Amino acid sequence: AGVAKFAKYPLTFGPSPISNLNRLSQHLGSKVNVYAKREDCNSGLAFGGNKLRKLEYIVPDIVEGDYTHLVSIGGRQSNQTRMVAALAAKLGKKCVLIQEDWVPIPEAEKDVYNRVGNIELSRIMGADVRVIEDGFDIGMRKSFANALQELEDAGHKPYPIPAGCSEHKYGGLGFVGFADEVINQEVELGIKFDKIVVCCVTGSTTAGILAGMAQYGRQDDVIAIDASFTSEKTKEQTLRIANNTAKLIGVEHEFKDFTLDTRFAYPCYGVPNEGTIEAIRTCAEQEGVLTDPVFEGKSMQGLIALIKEDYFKPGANVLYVHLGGAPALSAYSSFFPTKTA
């Protein structure tokens, strides 16, 4: 073990807080005690989020080396790119973002969906936002590739940052430190967490938590709720990252598999189902915490489902990992009508 041997650049206030959602717990039958590690309350940089934790280990590279532009990629309401933008700004460097068509832009939303939410913030931060129309994929893209070359031939030095940082060499380190941090907060809080629920789409967050938790032999505490709907390639890339990050930090353990619940990614990436919406409501109504229809909502419904079906031992302390993404809620305004009194 040793994430400590890796250069880190501060992009957050420090250990993200842990909220005690004791009210949402009772509402769900008091079967478990739900807690939430607020990564959505990461830093001052454009609403923060899980991405900032990842970026903290990639930045040093960008700074030591000589670069000029930071180019990343993601969907329309990509939280990722919005943070690379904020990052680029804070680092005083140019930024090129490739917004692809990863989600079937719902009808009563194709008006705002492309200019009201996360993408808007990237522009406001002065990023070179580029709207392209390609499919959804958690791997390396050709568009991302050409964009890179474009800048190079232009005489610049582009810094590549794959979707969600996941496939990046150090894309898994940020959440390794997330485990160290959780272990420490368990002691200060006087609360041991039996399980950790986290949304998974491109990997790294879960992989990092897996490799990190492994340092204490607790990898199995993890429960990733798929939100990509492409479970197959998702579990393969997550596991691929987990083993690399483990090798990096010195963890000998070999990840052959992990808990990846797939019952909630439907209909598909970026589109919430009746369940997602119900979960966002329930959580918002009970704790005043906001979750989005693309990720947190689904991981939340998932959390709610498992609790329902008495998946956890009676009284178990479950740590829900709120990764953020609430700023993209304005591109889904149509999914939440007003409640009757």
Nearest to 196 by CA among 26, 50, 321: 321
Check binding of 242 to a copy of itself (CB under 8 A).
no
Nearest to 168 by CA among 53, 55, 45: 55
Quickly count: other Cβ atoms within 10 Å of residue 98's Cβ.
24
DSSP lists the bridge partners of residue 35 as 20, 319
Q: After which residues is the chain broken (C to N over 2.5 A)?
A: none
H/E stretch holding 277 reads helix 274-287
Nearest to 95 by CA among 55, 141, 64: 55
Check binding of 274 to a copy of itself (CB under 8 A).
no
Contact window for a copy of itself (CB under 8 A) among 126-134, 196-204, 208-216, 303-311 = 126-134
Quickly count: other Cβ atoms within 10 Å of residue 174's Cβ.
29
Provide the annotated active-site residues.
78
Residues 58-87 that bind a copy of itself (CB under 8 A): 85-87
Alpha-helical runs (H) found in 288-334 = 296-308
Check binding of 152 to a copy of itself (CB under 8 A).
no
Q: Least distance in Å: CB of 143 to a copy of itself? A: 17
Check binding of 327 to a copy of itself (CB under 8 A).
yes
Check binding of 256 to a copy of itself (CB under 8 A).
no
H/E stretch holding 274 reads helix 274-287
Tokens found for residue 86: 């904020």
Tokens found for residue 167: 């496939």
Q: Least distance in Å: CB of 17 to a copy of itself? A: 5
Q: Which is nearer to a copy of itself, 40 or 221 (CB)?
A: 40
Considering only 73, 127, 224, 304, the residue that binds a copy of itself (CB under 8 A) is 127
Distance CA 102, CA 201 (A): 12
Considering only 3, 62, 121, 225, the residue that binds a copy of itself (CB under 8 A) is 121
Cβ contact 259:317 at 8 Å: no
Check binding of 338 to a copy of itself (CB under 8 A).
yes
Contact mark string toward a copy of itself, 279..318, x via CB under 8 A: -xx--xxxxxxx----------------------------
Check binding of 13 to a copy of itself (CB under 8 A).
yes
Residues 33-52 that bind a copy of itself (CB under 8 A): 36, 38, 40-41, 43-48
Omega of the bond leading into 293 within 30 degrees of 0 (cis): no
**Size, binding site for a copy of itself by CB under 8 A:** 58
Considering only 116, 260, 268, 316, the residue that binds a copy of itself (CB under 8 A) is 116
Considering only 56, 120, 167, 180, the residue that binds a copy of itself (CB under 8 A) is 120
Angle formed at CA 184 by CA 178 and CA 185, multiple of 5 degrees: 85
Q: Where on the chain is the footprint of a copy of itself (CB under 8 A)?
A: 13, 17, 19, 23, 36, 38, 40-41, 43-48, 85-90, 92, 94, 111-112, 115-117, 120-121, 123-129, 280-281, 284-290, 322, 326-327, 329-331, 333-334, 336-339, 341
